[PDB]
Ligand binder design. Structure first.
Ligand SMILES: [Mg+2]
Ligand SMILES: [Mg+2]
Lengths: 221, 186, 169, 143
RNA sequence: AUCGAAUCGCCACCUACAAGACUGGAGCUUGCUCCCUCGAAGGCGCCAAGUAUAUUCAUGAUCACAAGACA
RNA sequence: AAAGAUUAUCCGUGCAAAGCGGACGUCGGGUCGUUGGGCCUGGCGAGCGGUGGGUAGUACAUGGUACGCUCAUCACC
């Protein structure tokens, strides 16, 4: 994680600038857990670097009690002779998603671990990801197109909090502060947004006339 | 399935009903109430001019259709709550040991139930007002007052469930705390 | 409010060989199927459409169920629904998509210069306005430091450093 | 010694006032190939046959889309450890590099989702190329 | 400083939020009518800093990792 | 994690605000590339400091540190 002094020295000798790999950031809020994992697992195997946020807002079909009991049945499975080196049951919603993706990969091959190590999961949206670019969704894994709205569903964070996850309140407080800060920033920069809108509207009267007709033909004016 | 099922409700003059995303707010005199019905998946409309509330289920089988009459009853209860209120009268019935009920501000203490030394305490939420009738009029009566029928009930029910006889023949041991009158404040 | 599925309702076909064509509901079979027809479109004779493949529009002509072909044509012309629909933005976008799909490499170049020309003039207008009332990051920051810089640069010591190092240039 | 913030303020003052609405323009060497990724080889539950490779190309998601690329030349670009011989080794000495390329062609579409079958020249593509970038050029042109 | 590399879309307009049983706004008649910004585009970027008066490109000789890459 | 001449071109304060409050100078040289140019370096000062000399009271659990005043030295420089 933390760069070595040799790595920093080599970069300065090369004189290169800041580098960021092409990373897709997925907002997992109101996404079906299984369908999102299957889509993400295939993309990881195709060499994509994927970061998922708001894992605590994933959805599973059924009542919360039914899915809580499902996790508790998974929790009771452990190597009796030595619970260490036994099955490791992770309670955080981001680790639950990571485990779901891992079971959908060839995890016991080097290629499978290369795909798995290309995925980063978070609860909420941490500051290092907030300003990296627009977030994406998976339309075929979204709740409002996947579930019939009459059926009950569970939120992953609510299920995880009652089976051992201890940071439900921390994530909620951090997410509240993030949205207020983003809303305040978005309440500002409105003048900049409207200034460019009027600049595009006023520019129609300054460009050559035949260029306006071309824009109208292709539905841009 | 049935293409269109609907129920209608008339709104009195002094009360207004607002619906937005299956969230119903009923405002009248003596207070206001709000109900979250985002779990229902119904079509709620309010005709402000004609004072009608309508709930519609499109392409519903028996189970979804059973919910629209429940929705109408809930809105009707809210309308009654913000116009007349709800009053539950509770009587302490005992054979030998008097049931001493102490009612402080929002706090209820029950003592000497079947002679037990344990004190039963209940904290009434601020939306429900609990008062004890003067014994000169009617003996050992407790009155619960509030706008929400759901809240006024289960405040008396919680009181009833706290004074339950254990390890005895309940046919013979009839001591307890029972609701007697369900009425309106005004 | 969403537009109901009813006799006389105008719809647009979502997918399939009749994609992005407009028709009239004419009749309703059951919860899943209707009988769309549009006299003014050649490929839009009376036929069955699944309700999952239609998008109701804001226009409904006054026809009865299983109306005659002549009655639908008269109602469609009198209501001017097609003329009204063609003036909307979504109708224009559908025409624009067809124009881009059949476009050549030369027309794609023409659109590219047309959008670039508008982009250039939007910047010219924005920068002229940003000079008067600062709204961008560089003009707002410049205004935020002009008052402090003027106060600090007006000192006698700063003025001595002004000329003594400008003259070296 | 006078603090540098005095000279720094002057540079900042002139740059911010001289700033206009300018955008970054991509006027570098153009890209003449479609970007693709090697998914793997043709296979069943019994195992794989490495003489044929499967390549997924961005924006090619239909069998009709994949038919357009039948016959196109396909290139996989990697690097070795040392600088070895290449095309125009003596004609163009600037081309000498550790960069190497393996060349193939699209033989047929695969499935209904724009997947393509690619056969490489003589040998098979290395399995270390699975999940890596595959270049799908526009030649031989049919237009 | 070995080191030659594979990668080929930028942004200080997306990079805030929420809901798909209804989120542009009204009316009553509650599914129709009316108003509007007409409800199906994040903005740029693709070779003259902008649509015109223009201007070096070769012999790198017909494909070859773009022989180059701080947009 | 930060939040900007693309993280460079200062420090606080504030809400990724509106604003507001602060900042060591001066005299030369050398050496590279659009404005009081970057870097290196020397002489006079000043300030915040680190150690030691001489001195006074006080604090803390009372041998052992801190603090005032004043010299010398080093560092930012
Ligand atoms: Mg839905
Ligand atoms: Mg000096």
């Amino acid at each position: 994680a933390f760069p070595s002094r040799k790595d920093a020295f080599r970069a300065q000798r090369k004189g290169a600038k800041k580098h960021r790999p092409e990373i897709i950031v997925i907002d997992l809020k109101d996404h079906v857990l299984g369908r999102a994992a299957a889509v993400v697992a295939k993309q990881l195997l195709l060499g994509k670097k994927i970061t998922v946020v708001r894992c605590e807002q994933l959805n599973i079909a059924g009542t919360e009690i039914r899915n809580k009991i499902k996790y508790l049945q998974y929790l009771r499975k452990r190597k009796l002779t030595n619970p260490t080196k036994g099955p490791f049951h992770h309670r955080a919603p981001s680790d639950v998603f990571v485990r779901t993706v891992r079971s959908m990969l060839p995890r016991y091959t080097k290629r499978g671990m290369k795909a798995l190590n290309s995925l980063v999961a978070y609860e909420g949206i941490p500051p290092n990801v907030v300003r990296t670019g627009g977030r994406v969704v998976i339309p075929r894994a979204q709740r409002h197109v996947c579930y019939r709205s009459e059926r009950p569903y569970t939120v992953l964070g609510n299920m995880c909090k009652h089976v051992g996850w201890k940071y439900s309140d921390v994530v909620a407080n951090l997410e509240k502060a993030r949205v207020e800060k983003a809303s305040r920033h978005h309440e500002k920069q409105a003048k900049l947004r409207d200034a460019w809108k009027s600049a595009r509207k006023e520019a129609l009267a300054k460009m050559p006339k035949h260029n306006v007709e071309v824009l109208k033909k292709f539905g841009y004016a | 399935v049935k293409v269109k099922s609907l129920c209608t409700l008339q709104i009195p003059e002094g009360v207004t009903v607002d619906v937005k995303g299956r969230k119903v707010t009923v405002t009248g005199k003596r207070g206001t109430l709000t109900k979250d019905l985002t779990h229902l998946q119904l079509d709620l409309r309010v005709d402000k001019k004609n004072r009608t509330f309508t709930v519609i289920r499109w392409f519903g089988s028996k189970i979804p259709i059973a919910c629209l009459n429940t929705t109408k009853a809930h809105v009707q209860n809210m309308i009654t709550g913000v116009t007349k209120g709800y009053r539950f009268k509770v009587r302490c019935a005992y054979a030998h040991f008097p049931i001493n009920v102490s009612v402080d501000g929002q706090n209820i203490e029950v003592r000497n139930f079947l002679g037990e030394k344990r004190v039963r305490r209940q904290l009434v939420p601020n939306t429900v007002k609990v008062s004890q009738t003067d014994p000169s009029k009617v003996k050992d009566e407790i009155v619960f007052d509030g706008n929400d029928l759901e809240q006024v009930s289960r405040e008396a029910a919680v009181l009833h469930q706290m004074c339950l006889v254990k390890k005895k023949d309940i046919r013979k041991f009839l001591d307890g705390i029972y609701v007697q009158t369900k009425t309106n404040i005004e | 409010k969403s537009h109901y599925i009813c006799a006389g309702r105008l719809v647009r076909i979502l997918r399939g060989p009749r994609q992005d064509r407009v028709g009239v509901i004419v009749d309703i079979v059951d919860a899943n199927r209707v009988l769309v027809e549009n006299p003014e479109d050649a490929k839009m004779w009376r036929h069955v459409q699944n309700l999952k493949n239609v998008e109701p529009l804001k226009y409904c002509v006054s026809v009865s169920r299983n109306c005659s072909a002549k009655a639908l044509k008269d109602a469609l012309a009198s209501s001017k629904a097609l003329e009204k629909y063609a003036k909307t933005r979504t109708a224009a976008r559908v025409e624009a998509k067809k124009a881009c799909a059949v476009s050549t490499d030369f027309e794609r170049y023409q659109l590219r210069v047309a959008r670039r020309s508008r982009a250039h003039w939007a910047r010219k207008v924005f920068d002229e306005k940003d000079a008067k009332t600062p709204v961008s990051w560089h003009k707002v920051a410049l205004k935020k430091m002009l008052k402090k810089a003027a106060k600090m640069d007006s000192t006698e010591g700063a003025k001595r450093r002004m000329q003594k190092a400008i003259a070296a240039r | 010694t006078t603090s540098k913030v005095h000279s720094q303020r002057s540079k900042k003052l002139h740059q911010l006032s001289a700033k206009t609405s300018r955008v970054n323009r991509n006027r570098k060497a153009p890209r003449l190939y479609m970007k693709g990724t090697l998914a793997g080889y043709t296979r069943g539950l019994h195992g794989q046959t490495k003489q044929t490779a499967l390549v997924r190309v961005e924006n090619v998601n239909t069998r009709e889309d994949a038919t357009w690329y039948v016959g196109k030349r396909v290139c996989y670009v990697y690097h070795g450890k040392k600088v070895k011989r290449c095309v125009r080794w003596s004609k163009a000495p600037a081309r000498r590099s550790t960069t190497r390329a393996l060349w193939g062609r699209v033989t047929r579409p695969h499935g209904n989702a724009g997947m393509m079958r690619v056969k490489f020249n003589g040998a098979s593509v290395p399995a270390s190329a699975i999940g890596r970038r595959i270049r799908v050029y526009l030649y031989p042109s049919q237009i």
